[PDB]
Design a protein around this nucleic acid. Structure first.
Ligand SMILES: [Zn+2]
Lengths: 49, 76, 176, 60, 141, 117
RNA sequence: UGUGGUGGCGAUAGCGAGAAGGAUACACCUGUUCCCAUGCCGAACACAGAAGUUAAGCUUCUUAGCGCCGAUUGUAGUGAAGGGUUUCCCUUUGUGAGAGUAGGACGUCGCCACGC
RNA sequence: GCGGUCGCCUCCUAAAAGGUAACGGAGGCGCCCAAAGGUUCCCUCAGAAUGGUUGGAAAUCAUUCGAAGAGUGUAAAGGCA
RNA sequence: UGAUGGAGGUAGAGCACUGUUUGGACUAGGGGCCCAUCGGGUUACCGAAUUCAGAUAAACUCCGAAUGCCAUUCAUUUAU
């Protein structure tokens, strides 16, 4: 149903953020233009595999 | 064998500041759940519908015509 | 068209004489035609809505809407969001030409000539006429294979029965 | 008129077995018969000659 | 055991009440009425007894007004059950009457049958009474 | 058929815009008023309620047809009468209107002639 | 003084019903090529216009039918002080509501513009 | 002892600030939504009367009256035109 | 203690809303029984739309008290 999920900076590769999804509505891996703390720059974040 | 007797807890609403106090920055004035009193001059609404005191001063209560009331602060 | 010039020349001043309007601005007029096709059977078959929209687009110049449901009743077997009917609004010059077609073509294609049914009275200039059937020149036997009809809702700016009757009467509408 | 969402219709003249009143519009087409400048320069092929003149509400 | 005047609940239980005092509430419909002078509950069955002792002196009908109706409910435990658990089962339908709600009203009949009827009515209710007309009435249309 | 007269909805949208911020003590309003023929503008404080500078459409000096043509002229004249009194940070009233002409011309002509937005 | 725009003050500003007006102004009103728009539709929204009219809106005036604001009374209730039965009632001293009204009420004050 | 109950959230009991017990009286919870979030524009409901082809008291329509009699993801208060 | 300011839904009223309910008038048409086998619908509840008078409430509100409660560069007295 709904699983805890962690995001991933696609450049410096740190598990930055955490959120929740409903994986029968959304079976894919999300893509949001979140913020990166280590780089101070907007970075497209994706689901950790 | 009764199927009752279970409770909430008292979450302690009600005004926590009179008229004519000397009020510092940011302190709570009247804690609501549901908009019973709208804010006015220099007073904002929190997430849980409380009320602040931005500018240091004096709390006074007023009307809004007939229905509802206001809180505002006037400094020196 | 025919009817606008009938207003500007002959329809208006006799109606002015019958009631003695102190200004010409109190000439009552014709605004709208609302056309509706409630189906009900299209809940069983989504292919029922495949043809009524085609028929109304042929008769009018507009694709009608696909109307919502407004309720949720199982005694009439309806959820919300159910596509049931189809509205056509009509303004401007297609109003007058469609009424011209109604005068010249539709009414002489009625079985059992008895007259236009009067009793749509409603007091306030709102005459509606149910239409049951092939009463139109842009229709084939080999195209239309259902027993669908039409709807007319003409709404005026009149205020009595009588002024509405004379607006419809000097323009046509052969009642009983 | 919003574009690309409307059917075709033109000033299609009427013709009739009683005098052929040449006035109005329509949508259907066919053979070029009355491209006539005083009226609609298009097909007059609204030609079901049911008159609305032979029927005894207009006739008597 | 049949209740003459049941209700439609909204609630199985109510608190046991607390009655002090009222006044006014004069004769309105009829011409001859009681006045309770005290304060008690009055149950269902007493109103049946009042109906019958009213009517069995009335002849060919007449006029009978009932101006008091049960609303509230009682409960009671069993016999031999200790103190402890939840309330008893709801039984009966009772409504209190303070100092002076007029019990019933009569009209259309002369006084003597009326006073007999009200004496018969008053001896089947646990409250002391009187007898009242439209005595001092400035409002009579 | 009732036809709701159009100032009613304009005033409804005013009241649903004005209730955020007027704030007109040193950063006063602008004001924008249609008609079928003209355009008006006022610059008001609170709670004196006093217009400090104003200019009609075609009651003082005209340019052309009652158009965006006039709107650029009014947006000239308001700011030209305004910055003589020393006003810098004015706030727009949208009225109850949208932006497909006759108002944005006033906006742009208010921008160039000395009023900050 | 009129007319329009724009502000506070608790509808005492309202509702309903009745009358008059088009100087300027507002609005209806004629259209849609243009910027735009319609989950279809120049009805709206937006853009162009000066043929017609106070008919509606708008503005002025009349009405206490409706809604609103309503003094002084009394009465219910109650702090303190008491007294008999303690289910409840009564007495001194202080404070008093709601219903019922006589009465008020068909606005008051601010700025700008254009005529007058 | 047999039964019932053990944490959290609403309402009454609760004596008009806050607080207040009983195997007193009543209902829920151990989630859901990638938009059912943020912004910016636009909009106003339930019903009732009267006519209208299949149409039935009650589908889709049209007019008028209507301060809310609606809705608000979920239980109840308090809010919100 | 006195003066001043507001927080509020208790006592009592408690009709406007939501619940429970008593008698009258009115029909709109349900009127099963009709006259019936072509218009009058006869009786009854007249229930809902209403519309009169009349009650009532811990979880009803159009309203609403004394008292306590929170404060004041306030006044007097007193000792925390
Ligand atoms: Zn990074």
């Amino acid at each position: 149903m709904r699983v805890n999920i962690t995001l991933e900076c696609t450049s410096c590769k740190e598990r930055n953020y955490l959120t929740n999804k409903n994986k029968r509505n959304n079976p894919d891996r999300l893509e949001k233009q979140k913020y990166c703390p280590r780089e101070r720059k907007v970075t497209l974040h994706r689901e950790t595999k | 064998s009764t199927s009752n007797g279970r409770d909430s807890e008292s979450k302690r609403l009600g005004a926590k500041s009179a008229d004519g106090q000397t009020v510092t920055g940011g302190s709570i004035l009247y804690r609501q759940r549901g908009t019973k009193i709208y804010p006015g001059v220099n007073v904002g609404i929190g997430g849980d519908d409380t009320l602040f005191a931005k500018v240091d001063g004096v709390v006074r209560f007023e009307r809004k015509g007939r229905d509802k009331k206001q809180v505002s602060v006037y400094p020196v | 068209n025919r009817l606008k010039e009938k207003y500007i020349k002959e329809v208006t001043p006799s109606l002015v004489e019958k009631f003695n309007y102190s200004s010409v601005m109190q000439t009552p007029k014709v605004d709208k035609i609302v056309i509706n096709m409630g189906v009900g059977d299209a809940v069983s078959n989504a292919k029922n809505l495949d043809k009524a929209v085609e028929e109304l687009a042929l008769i009018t110049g507009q694709k009608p809407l696909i109307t919502k449901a407004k309720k949720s009743i199982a005694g009439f077997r309806l959820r919300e969001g159910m596509p049931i009917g189809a509205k056509v609004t009509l303004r401007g010059e297609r109003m007058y030409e469609f009424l011209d077609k109604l005068v010249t073509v539709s009414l002489p294609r009625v079985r059992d000539f008895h007259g236009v049914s009067k009793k749509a009275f409603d007091g306030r200039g709102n005459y509606t006429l149910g239409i049951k059937e092939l009463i139109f020149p842009e229709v084939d036997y080999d195209l239309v294979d259902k027993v669908r009809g039409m709807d007319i809702v003409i709404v005026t700016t009149a205020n009595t029965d009588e002024e509405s009757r004379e607006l419809l009467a000097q323009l046509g509408m052969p009642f009983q | 008129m919003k574009q690309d969402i409307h059917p075709n219709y033109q000033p299609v003249v009427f013709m009739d077995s009683t005098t052929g009143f040449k006035f109005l519009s329509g949508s259907t087409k066919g053979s070029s018969e009355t491209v006539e400048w005083e009226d609609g320069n298009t097909y007059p092929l609204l030609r079901v000659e049911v008159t609305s003149d032979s029927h005894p509400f207009y006739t008597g | 055991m049949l209740v003459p005047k049941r209700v439609k609940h909204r609630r199985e239980f109510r608190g046991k009440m607390r009655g002090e005092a009222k006044g006014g509430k004069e004769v309105a419909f009829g011409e001859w009425g009681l006045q309770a002078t005290e304060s008690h509950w009055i149950t269902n069955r007493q109103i049946e007894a009042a109906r019958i002792a009213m009517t069995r002196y009335m002849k060919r009908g007449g006029k009978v007004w009932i101006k008091i109706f049960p609303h509230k409910s009682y409960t009671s435990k069993a016999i031999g059950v200790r103190m402890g658990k939840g309330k008893g089962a709801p039984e009966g339908w009772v409504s209190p009457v303070k100092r002076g709600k007029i019990m019933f009203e009569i009209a259309g009949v002369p006084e003597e049958v009326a006073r007999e009827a009200l004496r018969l009515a008053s001896h089947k209710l646990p409250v002391k009474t009187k007898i009242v007309k439209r005595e001092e009435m400035g409002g009579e249309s | 058929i009732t036809k709701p007269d159009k100032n009613k909805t304009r005033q409804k949208r005013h009241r649903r815009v004005r209730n955020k911020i007027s704030g007109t003590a040193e950063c006063p309003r602008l004001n924008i008023f249609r008609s079928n023929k003209n355009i008006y503008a006022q610059v008001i404080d609170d709670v004196a309620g006093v217009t400090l500078a104003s200019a009609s459409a075609l009651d003082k000096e005209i340019s052309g047809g009652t158009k965006t043509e006039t709107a650029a002229a009014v947006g000239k004249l308001v700011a030209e009468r305004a910055a003589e009194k020393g006003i810098k940070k004015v706030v727009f009233d949208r009225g109850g209107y949208l932006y497909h002409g006759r108002v944005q011309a006033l906006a742009e002509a208010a921008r160039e002639n000395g009023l900050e937005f």
